[PDB]
Every structure is written in C-alpha cells, then in structure tokens.
C-alpha cells in the first residue's frame, strides 16, 4: 500500500517532504545527497 502508478526516472529520487519525484542535480551540492542520487552526483554533470 501507499504507492504511485508510475515511478521516478533513473536520475530522480522520491522526495518525501515534497512527496514528489525530484531531479538529483538539485540535491547533490551538500548535506543530504539521497543515497540513490550519490551515484549520479559522483559522475557530476
């Protein structure tokens, strides 16, 4: 239970606060880089 019909794309993560798929490029410049986003943001651009 509690799930969306679709799913976030490969370079996105699910933001629980916003409750929304969010691009990781915005969450990779400090602090709490979501673990799913760390791959993408170690490869940068």
């Amino acid at each position: 239970m509690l799930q969306m019909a679709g799913q976030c794309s490969q370079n996105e993560y699910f933001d629980s606060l916003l409750h929304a798929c969010i691009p990781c490029q915005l969450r990779c410049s400090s602090n709490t880089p979501p673990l799913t986003c760390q791959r993408y943001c170690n490869a940068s651009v």
Epitope: M4, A5, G6, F14, S16, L17, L18, H19, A20, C21
Partner: nanobody, 119 residues
C-alpha cells in the same frame, strides 16, 4: 495552517461511484501536500490517497488502486477524491488532510464525512 471543509459523502450502493470534495481556505498547489484518509469503527486510521507538490506524484493504497483518484483544482482551491466501483470494505469516515511542503506530518484536517456502501 489551512482550513479544510469536506462535502459529498453519504450512502451509496456497491459498484456505484461517489466524489468527495474538500475546500481549502488558501491555495495548495505549490504549498501543501494533500491526502485522503479513512477510518472504520474499531479500526485504525489509514491513508487512502496522497497528492504532492504541484501534483507531480499521486499515491494510492493497494486496496483502492485503479478505483480511486485524487485530484486538485487550484482555481477552485478544492481537493477531489473520485471513488469508483465502491465495495462494502470502503465504508468509513473519510478525512482530507494537508501539510506544508516543509512539514512531515499532516497538520490540517477536515470534519470528516461518512461513506457507507450498501450490499
């Protein structure tokens, strides 16, 4: 903190449909996560549907998936829950809740509305 007022519920035969409404005092599109919850007698309160910031993602409980749909009219400032193919298991008090996108917990609640599905 937004105020929410619910409408629409009542008694409905099984297999029919019902649209619940929840009017907000302010705009919610880019400001609040919205949700529909339900609670049966003696049972715990469970989430049914959730719509997020700018309606990017909608989430549904597995029991209602494919039958219920949550939507948001920002011009009317109204949250809708469309309920199709209703079953007796859907009988409960339904609440609409909202929370600011920077708050983890739902902090505003509607009065609640009874939905009873006849057999």
């Amino acid at each position: 903190q937004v105020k929410l007022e619910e409408s629409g519920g009542g008694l409905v035969q099984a297999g029919r449909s019902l649209r619940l409404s929840c009017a907000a005092s302010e705009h919610t599109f880019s400001s609040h996560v919205m949700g529909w919850f339900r609670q049966a007698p003696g049972k715990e309160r469970e989430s049914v549907a959730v719509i997020g910031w700018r309606d990017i993602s909608t989430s549904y409980a597995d029991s209602v998936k494919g039958r219920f749909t949550i939507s948001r009219d920002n011009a009317k400032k109204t949250l809708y829950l469309q309920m199709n193919s209703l079953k007796p298991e859907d009988t409960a008090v339904y609440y609409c809740a909202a929370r600011r996108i920077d708050a983890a917990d739902f902090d505003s609640w509607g009065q609640g509305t009874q939905v009873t599905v006849s057999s």
